[PDB]
Amino acid sequence: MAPNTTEVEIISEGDGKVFPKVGDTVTIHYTGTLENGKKFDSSRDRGKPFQCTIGVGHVIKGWDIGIPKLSVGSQAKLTIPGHEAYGSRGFPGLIPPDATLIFDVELLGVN
Amino acid sequence: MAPNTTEVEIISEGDGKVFPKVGDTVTIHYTGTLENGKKFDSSRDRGKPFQCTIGVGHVIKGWDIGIPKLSVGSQAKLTIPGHEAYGSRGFPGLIPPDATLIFDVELLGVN
């Protein structure tokens, strides 16, 4: 029983003032795991926040949905169902078909 | 200058008799690299052929295009442009946006 759509749970509150909007560059730290807790990717392990354009389909749909809910400084958990992640394709070797993904994300900057 | 669409180059010929069709299960070995030769995934490293349904969007588009050209026993190189692979999303940590992917594939079985 995956979610119907991406769930956002803010763990630690950010500044409450600066939120991403469509087309912004976000600088974020993330760790992504499967429902069984197996990690498949983490910017924290690379020692370097990830940077991407939000809201324009340059990241998985669940990120486009959830990351704009965060203010800068927020830490949140995103629970993303398969159809807003990698779907039936998954990612061979790492992510099974139709996998719900769990992302622990920290928003460090908006441009 | 990526290809306009997926290129297939058969390196070693298969049996010339058994080809995948839409909806079949293919059992394949693959190694996938970026244009710079950096490997990002390989079933050969897992010691176990990959199995998937072909022609129904359960794998990247370039595989749906190219794998049905192979007969069982064939070894081929697929050169897949970004828009038939992971597109501008890529796969964070492994595959950059708009990346052309190179797959060395061996078709071991069709069901």
Coordinates of N, CA and C in Angstrom, one line a residue:
Chain A
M1 N 0.8 -1.2 0.0 CA 0.0 0.0 0.0 C 0.9 1.3 0.0
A2 N 1.3 1.7 -1.2 CA 2.0 2.9 -1.4 C 1.0 4.1 -1.2
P3 N 1.5 5.3 -1.1 CA 0.6 6.4 -1.0 C -0.1 6.6 -2.4
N4 N -1.2 7.3 -2.4 CA -1.8 7.7 -3.6 C -0.9 8.7 -4.3
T5 N -0.3 9.6 -3.6 CA 0.6 10.7 -4.1 C 1.6 11.0 -3.0
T6 N 2.6 11.8 -3.4 CA 3.8 12.1 -2.6 C 3.3 12.7 -1.3
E7 N 3.9 12.1 -0.2 CA 3.6 12.7 1.2 C 4.9 13.5 1.6
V8 N 4.6 14.6 2.3 CA 5.7 15.4 2.8 C 5.5 15.4 4.3
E9 N 6.6 15.2 5.1 CA 6.6 15.3 6.5 C 7.8 16.2 6.9
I10 N 7.5 17.4 7.4 CA 8.6 18.3 7.7 C 9.1 17.8 9.1
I11 N 10.4 17.4 9.2 CA 11.0 17.0 10.5 C 11.5 18.2 11.3
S12 N 12.2 19.1 10.6 CA 12.8 20.2 11.3 C 12.4 21.5 10.5
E13 N 11.9 22.5 11.1 CA 11.4 23.6 10.4 C 12.5 24.5 9.9
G14 N 12.4 25.1 8.7 CA 13.3 26.0 8.1 C 12.9 27.5 8.5
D15 N 13.3 28.4 7.7 CA 13.2 29.8 8.0 C 11.7 30.3 7.8
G16 N 10.9 29.5 7.1 CA 9.5 29.9 6.9 C 9.3 31.1 6.0
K17 N 10.4 31.5 5.3 CA 10.3 32.7 4.4 C 10.7 32.4 3.0
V18 N 11.6 31.5 2.7 CA 12.1 31.4 1.3 C 11.8 30.0 0.8
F19 N 10.8 29.9 -0.1 CA 10.3 28.6 -0.7 C 10.7 28.5 -2.1
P20 N 11.0 27.3 -2.6 CA 11.2 27.2 -4.1 C 9.9 27.5 -4.9
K21 N 10.1 28.1 -6.0 CA 9.0 28.1 -7.0 C 9.4 27.5 -8.3
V22 N 8.4 27.3 -9.2 CA 8.7 26.6 -10.5 C 9.8 27.4 -11.2
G23 N 10.8 26.6 -11.6 CA 12.0 27.2 -12.4 C 13.2 27.6 -11.5
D24 N 13.0 27.6 -10.2 CA 14.2 27.9 -9.3 C 15.2 26.8 -9.3
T25 N 16.4 27.2 -9.0 CA 17.5 26.2 -8.7 C 17.4 25.9 -7.2
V26 N 17.3 24.7 -6.8 CA 17.4 24.3 -5.4 C 18.7 23.6 -5.2
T27 N 19.4 24.0 -4.0 CA 20.5 23.3 -3.5 C 20.0 22.5 -2.2
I28 N 20.2 21.2 -2.3 CA 19.5 20.3 -1.3 C 20.5 19.2 -0.9
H29 N 20.4 18.7 0.3 CA 21.0 17.4 0.6 C 19.9 16.4 0.7
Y30 N 20.2 15.2 0.2 CA 19.2 14.1 0.3 C 19.9 12.8 0.5
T31 N 19.1 11.9 1.2 CA 19.3 10.4 1.2 C 18.1 9.7 0.7
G32 N 18.2 8.8 -0.2 CA 17.1 8.1 -0.7 C 17.2 6.6 -0.4
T33 N 16.1 6.0 0.1 CA 16.1 4.6 0.5 C 14.8 4.0 -0.1
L34 N 14.9 2.7 -0.2 CA 13.6 1.9 -0.5 C 12.8 1.7 0.8
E35 N 11.6 1.2 0.7 CA 10.8 1.0 1.8 C 11.4 0.1 2.8
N36 N 12.2 -0.9 2.4 CA 13.0 -1.8 3.3 C 14.2 -1.1 3.9
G37 N 14.4 0.2 3.7 CA 15.5 0.9 4.3 C 16.8 0.9 3.6
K38 N 16.9 0.1 2.5 CA 18.1 0.1 1.7 C 18.4 1.4 1.0
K39 N 19.5 2.0 1.3 CA 19.9 3.2 0.6 C 20.3 3.0 -0.8
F40 N 19.8 3.8 -1.8 CA 20.2 3.7 -3.2 C 21.0 4.9 -3.7
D41 N 21.0 6.0 -3.0 CA 21.7 7.2 -3.4 C 21.7 8.2 -2.3
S42 N 22.8 9.0 -2.2 CA 22.8 10.1 -1.2 C 23.8 11.1 -1.6
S43 N 23.4 12.4 -1.6 CA 24.4 13.5 -1.8 C 25.2 13.6 -0.5
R44 N 24.7 13.3 0.6 CA 25.5 13.4 1.9 C 26.7 12.6 1.8
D45 N 26.6 11.4 1.2 CA 27.8 10.5 1.1 C 28.8 11.1 0.1
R46 N 28.4 11.9 -0.9 CA 29.3 12.6 -1.8 C 29.9 13.8 -1.1
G47 N 29.5 14.2 0.1 CA 30.0 15.4 0.8 C 29.7 16.7 0.1
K48 N 28.6 16.7 -0.7 CA 28.3 17.9 -1.6 C 26.8 18.0 -1.9
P49 N 26.1 19.1 -1.5 CA 24.7 19.2 -1.8 C 24.5 19.1 -3.3
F50 N 23.3 18.5 -3.7 CA 22.9 18.4 -5.0 C 22.2 19.7 -5.5
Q51 N 22.3 20.0 -6.8 CA 21.7 21.2 -7.3 C 20.9 20.9 -8.6
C52 N 19.7 21.4 -8.6 CA 18.8 21.1 -9.8 C 17.7 22.1 -10.0
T53 N 17.1 22.1 -11.1 CA 15.9 23.0 -11.4 C 14.7 22.3 -10.9
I54 N 13.8 23.0 -10.1 CA 12.7 22.4 -9.6 C 11.4 22.8 -10.4
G55 N 10.4 21.9 -10.4 CA 9.1 22.2 -11.0 C 9.0 22.2 -12.5
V56 N 10.0 21.6 -13.2 CA 10.0 21.6 -14.7 C 10.4 20.2 -15.2
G57 N 10.1 19.2 -14.4 CA 10.4 17.8 -14.8 C 11.9 17.5 -15.0
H58 N 12.8 18.2 -14.4 CA 14.2 17.8 -14.5 C 14.6 16.9 -13.3
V59 N 13.7 16.6 -12.4 CA 13.8 15.6 -11.4 C 12.5 14.8 -11.3
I60 N 12.6 13.7 -10.5 CA 11.4 12.8 -10.4 C 10.2 13.6 -9.9
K61 N 9.0 13.2 -10.3 CA 7.8 14.0 -10.1 C 7.6 14.3 -8.6
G62 N 7.9 13.3 -7.7 CA 7.7 13.5 -6.3 C 8.5 14.6 -5.8
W63 N 9.7 14.9 -6.3 CA 10.5 16.0 -5.9 C 9.9 17.3 -6.4
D64 N 9.5 17.4 -7.6 CA 8.7 18.6 -8.1 C 7.5 18.9 -7.3
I65 N 6.9 17.8 -6.7 CA 5.7 18.0 -5.9 C 6.1 18.5 -4.5
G66 N 7.1 17.8 -3.9 CA 7.3 18.0 -2.4 C 8.3 19.1 -2.1
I67 N 9.4 19.2 -2.9 CA 10.4 20.2 -2.5 C 9.9 21.6 -2.4
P68 N 9.0 22.1 -3.3 CA 8.4 23.5 -3.1 C 7.7 23.7 -1.8
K69 N 7.3 22.6 -1.0 CA 6.7 22.8 0.3 C 7.7 23.2 1.4
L70 N 9.0 23.2 1.1 CA 10.0 23.4 2.1 C 10.5 24.8 2.1
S71 N 10.6 25.4 3.3 CA 11.4 26.7 3.3 C 12.9 26.3 3.5
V72 N 13.7 27.3 3.2 CA 15.2 27.1 3.3 C 15.5 26.8 4.8
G73 N 16.3 25.8 5.0 CA 16.6 25.3 6.3 C 15.8 24.1 6.8
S74 N 14.7 23.8 6.1 CA 13.8 22.7 6.5 C 14.5 21.4 6.2
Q75 N 14.2 20.4 7.1 CA 14.5 19.0 6.8 C 13.1 18.2 6.8
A76 N 12.9 17.4 5.8 CA 11.7 16.8 5.5 C 11.9 15.3 5.1
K77 N 10.9 14.5 5.2 CA 10.9 13.2 4.6 C 9.8 13.2 3.5
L78 N 10.2 12.8 2.3 CA 9.2 12.6 1.2 C 9.0 11.2 1.0
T79 N 7.8 10.7 0.9 CA 7.4 9.4 0.6 C 6.7 9.4 -0.8
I80 N 7.4 8.9 -1.8 CA 7.0 9.1 -3.2 C 6.6 7.7 -3.8
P81 N 5.4 7.6 -4.3 CA 4.9 6.3 -4.9 C 5.6 6.1 -6.2
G82 N 5.6 4.9 -6.7 CA 6.3 4.5 -7.9 C 5.9 5.4 -9.1
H83 N 4.6 5.7 -9.2 CA 4.2 6.5 -10.4 C 4.6 7.9 -10.4
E84 N 5.1 8.4 -9.3 CA 5.8 9.7 -9.2 C 7.3 9.6 -9.0
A85 N 7.8 8.4 -9.3 CA 9.3 8.2 -9.2 C 9.8 7.6 -10.4
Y86 N 10.2 6.3 -10.4 CA 10.7 5.6 -11.6 C 9.7 4.6 -12.2
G87 N 8.6 4.4 -11.6 CA 7.5 3.7 -12.2 C 7.9 2.2 -12.4
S88 N 7.3 1.6 -13.4 CA 7.6 0.2 -13.7 C 9.0 -0.1 -14.2
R89 N 9.7 1.0 -14.8 CA 11.0 0.8 -15.2 C 12.0 0.6 -14.0
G90 N 11.8 1.4 -12.9 CA 12.8 1.4 -11.9 C 14.1 1.9 -12.4
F91 N 15.2 1.4 -11.7 CA 16.5 1.6 -12.2 C 17.2 0.3 -12.0
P92 N 17.5 -0.5 -13.1 CA 18.1 -1.8 -12.9 C 19.3 -1.8 -12.1
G93 N 19.4 -2.7 -11.1 CA 20.5 -2.8 -10.2 C 20.2 -2.0 -8.9
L94 N 19.3 -1.1 -8.8 CA 19.2 -0.2 -7.6 C 17.7 -0.2 -7.2
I95 N 16.8 0.1 -8.1 CA 15.4 0.4 -7.8 C 14.5 -0.6 -8.5
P96 N 13.7 -1.4 -7.8 CA 12.8 -2.3 -8.4 C 11.6 -1.6 -9.1
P97 N 10.9 -2.3 -10.0 CA 9.7 -1.7 -10.6 C 8.7 -1.3 -9.5
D98 N 8.0 -0.2 -9.8 CA 6.9 0.3 -9.0 C 7.3 0.6 -7.6
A99 N 8.5 1.0 -7.3 CA 9.0 1.1 -5.9 C 8.6 2.5 -5.3
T100 N 8.1 2.4 -4.1 CA 8.0 3.6 -3.3 C 9.3 4.0 -2.7
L101 N 9.7 5.3 -2.9 CA 11.0 5.8 -2.5 C 10.8 6.7 -1.3
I102 N 11.8 6.7 -0.4 CA 11.8 7.5 0.8 C 13.0 8.5 0.7
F103 N 12.8 9.8 0.7 CA 13.9 10.7 0.6 C 13.9 11.6 1.9
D104 N 15.1 11.6 2.5 CA 15.3 12.6 3.6 C 16.0 13.8 3.0
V105 N 15.4 14.9 2.9 CA 15.9 16.1 2.2 C 16.0 17.3 3.1
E106 N 17.1 18.0 2.9 CA 17.3 19.3 3.6 C 17.5 20.4 2.5
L107 N 16.7 21.4 2.5 CA 16.8 22.5 1.6 C 17.8 23.5 2.1
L108 N 18.9 23.7 1.4 CA 19.9 24.6 1.8 C 19.9 25.9 1.0
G109 N 19.3 26.0 -0.2 CA 19.3 27.2 -0.9 C 18.3 27.3 -2.0
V110 N 17.8 28.4 -2.3 CA 16.9 28.7 -3.5 C 17.5 29.8 -4.3
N111 N 17.7 29.5 -5.6 CA 17.9 30.6 -6.5 C 16.8 30.7 -7.7
Chain B
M1 N 27.2 15.7 -30.1 CA 26.4 15.2 -31.1 C 25.9 13.7 -30.9
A2 N 24.9 13.6 -30.1 CA 24.2 12.3 -29.8 C 23.6 11.8 -31.1
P3 N 23.2 10.5 -31.2 CA 22.4 10.1 -32.3 C 21.0 10.7 -32.3
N4 N 20.4 10.8 -33.5 CA 19.0 11.2 -33.5 C 18.1 10.2 -32.8
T5 N 18.4 8.9 -32.9 CA 17.7 7.8 -32.3 C 18.7 6.6 -32.1
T6 N 18.2 5.7 -31.3 CA 19.1 4.5 -30.9 C 19.7 3.8 -32.1
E7 N 21.0 3.6 -31.9 CA 21.8 2.9 -32.9 C 22.1 1.5 -32.4
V8 N 21.9 0.5 -33.3 CA 22.2 -0.9 -32.9 C 23.4 -1.3 -33.8
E9 N 24.4 -1.9 -33.2 CA 25.6 -2.5 -33.9 C 25.7 -3.9 -33.4
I10 N 25.4 -4.9 -34.2 CA 25.6 -6.3 -33.8 C 27.1 -6.7 -33.9
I11 N 27.7 -7.0 -32.8 CA 29.1 -7.4 -32.7 C 29.2 -8.9 -33.1
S12 N 28.4 -9.7 -32.5 CA 28.6 -11.2 -32.7 C 27.2 -11.7 -33.0
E13 N 27.0 -12.5 -34.1 CA 25.7 -12.9 -34.5 C 25.1 -14.0 -33.7
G14 N 23.8 -13.9 -33.4 CA 23.1 -15.0 -32.8 C 22.6 -16.0 -33.7
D15 N 21.5 -16.7 -33.3 CA 21.1 -17.9 -34.1 C 20.3 -17.4 -35.3
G16 N 19.9 -16.2 -35.4 CA 19.2 -15.7 -36.6 C 17.7 -16.2 -36.7
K17 N 17.2 -16.9 -35.6 CA 15.9 -17.5 -35.6 C 14.9 -17.0 -34.6
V18 N 15.4 -16.7 -33.4 CA 14.5 -16.3 -32.3 C 14.7 -14.9 -31.9
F19 N 13.8 -14.0 -32.2 CA 13.8 -12.6 -31.9 C 12.8 -12.2 -30.9
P20 N 13.0 -11.2 -30.0 CA 12.0 -10.8 -29.1 C 10.9 -10.0 -29.9
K21 N 9.7 -10.2 -29.4 CA 8.6 -9.4 -29.9 C 7.9 -8.7 -28.7
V22 N 7.1 -7.7 -29.0 CA 6.4 -6.9 -28.0 C 5.8 -7.8 -27.0
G23 N 6.0 -7.6 -25.7 CA 5.4 -8.4 -24.6 C 6.2 -9.6 -24.1
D24 N 7.3 -10.0 -24.9 CA 8.1 -11.1 -24.5 C 9.0 -10.7 -23.2
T25 N 9.3 -11.8 -22.5 CA 10.4 -11.7 -21.5 C 11.7 -11.9 -22.1
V26 N 12.6 -11.0 -22.0 CA 14.0 -11.2 -22.5 C 14.9 -11.4 -21.3
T27 N 15.8 -12.4 -21.4 CA 16.9 -12.7 -20.5 C 18.2 -12.2 -21.2
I28 N 18.9 -11.2 -20.6 CA 20.0 -10.5 -21.3 C 21.1 -10.3 -20.3
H29 N 22.4 -10.2 -20.8 CA 23.4 -9.6 -20.1 C 23.7 -8.3 -20.6
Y30 N 24.0 -7.3 -19.8 CA 24.4 -5.9 -20.3 C 25.4 -5.3 -19.4
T31 N 26.2 -4.4 -20.0 CA 27.0 -3.4 -19.3 C 26.7 -2.1 -19.9
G32 N 26.4 -1.1 -19.1 CA 26.1 0.3 -19.5 C 27.1 1.3 -19.1
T33 N 27.6 2.1 -20.0 CA 28.6 3.1 -19.8 C 28.1 4.4 -20.3
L34 N 28.7 5.5 -19.8 CA 28.6 6.8 -20.4 C 29.5 6.9 -21.6
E35 N 29.3 8.0 -22.4 CA 30.2 8.2 -23.5 C 31.6 8.3 -23.1
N36 N 31.9 8.8 -21.9 CA 33.3 8.8 -21.5 C 33.8 7.4 -21.0
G37 N 33.0 6.4 -21.2 CA 33.4 5.0 -20.8 C 33.2 4.7 -19.4
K38 N 32.7 5.6 -18.5 CA 32.5 5.2 -17.1 C 31.3 4.3 -17.0
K39 N 31.5 3.1 -16.4 CA 30.4 2.2 -16.2 C 29.5 2.7 -15.1
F40 N 28.1 2.6 -15.3 CA 27.2 2.9 -14.3 C 26.3 1.7 -13.9
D41 N 26.3 0.6 -14.6 CA 25.5 -0.6 -14.2 C 25.9 -1.8 -15.1
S42 N 25.9 -3.0 -14.5 CA 26.2 -4.2 -15.3 C 25.6 -5.4 -14.6
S43 N 24.8 -6.1 -15.4 CA 24.3 -7.4 -14.9 C 25.5 -8.4 -14.8
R44 N 26.5 -8.2 -15.7 CA 27.6 -9.2 -15.6 C 28.4 -9.1 -14.3
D45 N 28.5 -7.9 -13.7 CA 29.1 -7.8 -12.4 C 28.3 -8.4 -11.3
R46 N 26.9 -8.5 -11.5 CA 26.1 -9.3 -10.5 C 26.1 -10.8 -10.8
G47 N 26.8 -11.2 -11.8 CA 26.9 -12.6 -12.1 C 25.6 -13.3 -12.5
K48 N 24.6 -12.5 -13.0 CA 23.3 -13.0 -13.2 C 22.6 -12.2 -14.3
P49 N 22.2 -12.8 -15.4 CA 21.5 -12.1 -16.5 C 20.2 -11.4 -15.9
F50 N 19.9 -10.2 -16.5 CA 18.8 -9.4 -16.2 C 17.6 -10.0 -17.0
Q51 N 16.4 -9.9 -16.4 CA 15.1 -10.3 -17.0 C 14.1 -9.2 -17.0
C52 N 13.4 -9.0 -18.1 CA 12.5 -7.9 -18.2 C 11.5 -8.1 -19.3
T53 N 10.4 -7.4 -19.3 CA 9.4 -7.4 -20.4 C 9.8 -6.4 -21.5
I54 N 9.9 -6.8 -22.7 CA 10.3 -5.9 -23.8 C 9.1 -5.3 -24.5
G55 N 9.3 -4.1 -25.0 CA 8.3 -3.5 -25.9 C 7.1 -2.8 -25.3
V56 N 7.1 -2.7 -23.9 CA 5.9 -2.2 -23.2 C 6.3 -1.1 -22.3
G57 N 7.4 -0.4 -22.5 CA 7.8 0.6 -21.6 C 8.2 0.3 -20.2
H58 N 8.6 -1.0 -19.9 CA 9.1 -1.4 -18.6 C 10.6 -1.3 -18.6
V59 N 11.3 -0.8 -19.6 CA 12.7 -0.5 -19.7 C 12.8 0.8 -20.5
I60 N 14.0 1.4 -20.5 CA 14.2 2.6 -21.2 C 13.9 2.4 -22.7
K61 N 13.5 3.5 -23.3 CA 13.0 3.5 -24.7 C 14.0 2.8 -25.6
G62 N 15.3 3.2 -25.5 CA 16.3 2.6 -26.4 C 16.4 1.1 -26.3
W63 N 16.1 0.5 -25.2 CA 16.1 -0.9 -25.1 C 14.9 -1.5 -25.8
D64 N 13.7 -0.9 -25.6 CA 12.5 -1.3 -26.4 C 12.7 -1.2 -27.9
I65 N 13.5 -0.2 -28.3 CA 13.8 -0.1 -29.7 C 14.8 -1.1 -30.2
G66 N 15.9 -1.3 -29.5 CA 17.1 -2.0 -30.0 C 17.0 -3.5 -29.7
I67 N 16.6 -3.9 -28.5 CA 16.7 -5.3 -28.2 C 15.9 -6.2 -29.1
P68 N 14.7 -5.8 -29.6 CA 14.0 -6.7 -30.6 C 14.8 -6.9 -31.9
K69 N 15.8 -6.2 -32.2 CA 16.6 -6.4 -33.4 C 17.6 -7.6 -33.2
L70 N 17.7 -8.1 -32.0 CA 18.7 -9.2 -31.7 C 18.1 -10.6 -31.8
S71 N 18.8 -11.5 -32.4 CA 18.4 -12.9 -32.2 C 19.1 -13.5 -31.0
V72 N 18.5 -14.6 -30.5 CA 19.2 -15.2 -29.3 C 20.6 -15.6 -29.6
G73 N 21.5 -15.3 -28.7 CA 22.9 -15.5 -28.9 C 23.7 -14.3 -29.4
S74 N 22.9 -13.2 -29.9 CA 23.6 -12.0 -30.4 C 24.3 -11.2 -29.3
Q75 N 25.4 -10.6 -29.6 CA 26.0 -9.6 -28.8 C 26.0 -8.3 -29.7
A76 N 25.5 -7.2 -29.1 CA 25.3 -5.9 -29.8 C 25.7 -4.8 -28.9
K77 N 26.0 -3.6 -29.5 CA 26.2 -2.4 -28.8 C 25.1 -1.5 -29.2
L78 N 24.3 -1.0 -28.2 CA 23.3 0.0 -28.3 C 23.8 1.4 -27.9
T79 N 23.7 2.4 -28.8 CA 24.0 3.7 -28.5 C 22.7 4.5 -28.4
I80 N 22.3 4.9 -27.2 CA 21.0 5.4 -26.9 C 21.0 6.9 -26.5
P81 N 20.4 7.8 -27.3 CA 20.4 9.2 -26.9 C 19.6 9.5 -25.7
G82 N 19.9 10.7 -25.1 CA 19.2 11.0 -23.8 C 17.7 10.9 -23.9
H83 N 17.1 11.4 -24.9 CA 15.6 11.4 -25.0 C 15.0 10.0 -25.1
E84 N 15.8 9.0 -25.4 CA 15.4 7.6 -25.3 C 16.0 6.9 -24.1
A85 N 16.5 7.6 -23.2 CA 17.1 7.0 -22.0 C 16.5 7.6 -20.7
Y86 N 17.3 8.4 -20.0 CA 16.8 9.1 -18.8 C 16.6 10.6 -19.0
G87 N 16.8 11.1 -20.2 CA 16.4 12.5 -20.5 C 17.2 13.5 -19.6
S88 N 16.5 14.6 -19.4 CA 17.1 15.7 -18.6 C 17.2 15.3 -17.1
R89 N 16.3 14.4 -16.6 CA 16.4 13.9 -15.3 C 17.7 13.2 -15.0
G90 N 18.1 12.3 -15.9 CA 19.3 11.4 -15.6 C 19.0 10.6 -14.4
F91 N 20.0 10.2 -13.7 CA 19.9 9.5 -12.4 C 20.9 10.1 -11.5
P92 N 20.5 10.9 -10.5 CA 21.4 11.6 -9.7 C 22.5 10.6 -9.1
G93 N 23.7 11.0 -9.2 CA 24.8 10.2 -8.7 C 25.4 9.3 -9.8
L94 N 24.7 9.0 -10.8 CA 25.2 8.0 -11.8 C 25.2 8.6 -13.2
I95 N 24.1 9.2 -13.6 CA 23.8 9.5 -15.0 C 23.5 11.0 -15.1
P96 N 24.3 11.8 -15.8 CA 24.0 13.2 -16.0 C 22.8 13.5 -16.8
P97 N 22.2 14.7 -16.8 CA 21.1 15.1 -17.7 C 21.5 14.9 -19.1
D98 N 20.5 14.5 -19.9 CA 20.6 14.4 -21.4 C 21.8 13.4 -21.8
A99 N 22.1 12.4 -21.1 CA 23.3 11.6 -21.3 C 23.0 10.5 -22.4
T100 N 23.9 10.5 -23.4 CA 23.9 9.3 -24.3 C 24.5 8.1 -23.6
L101 N 23.8 7.0 -23.6 CA 24.2 5.8 -22.9 C 24.7 4.7 -23.9
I102 N 25.7 3.9 -23.5 CA 26.2 2.9 -24.3 C 26.0 1.6 -23.6
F103 N 25.3 0.6 -24.2 CA 25.0 -0.7 -23.6 C 25.6 -1.8 -24.5
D104 N 26.4 -2.6 -23.9 CA 26.8 -3.8 -24.5 C 25.9 -4.9 -24.0
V105 N 25.1 -5.5 -24.9 CA 24.0 -6.4 -24.6 C 24.2 -7.8 -25.3
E106 N 23.9 -8.8 -24.5 CA 23.9 -10.2 -25.1 C 22.5 -10.8 -24.8
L107 N 21.8 -11.2 -25.8 CA 20.5 -11.8 -25.7 C 20.7 -13.3 -25.5
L108 N 20.3 -13.8 -24.3 CA 20.4 -15.2 -23.9 C 19.1 -15.9 -24.0
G109 N 17.9 -15.2 -23.9 CA 16.7 -16.0 -24.0 C 15.5 -15.1 -24.3
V110 N 14.5 -15.7 -25.0 CA 13.2 -15.0 -25.2 C 12.1 -15.9 -24.7
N111 N 11.2 -15.4 -23.9 CA 10.0 -16.0 -23.6 C 8.7 -15.2 -24.0

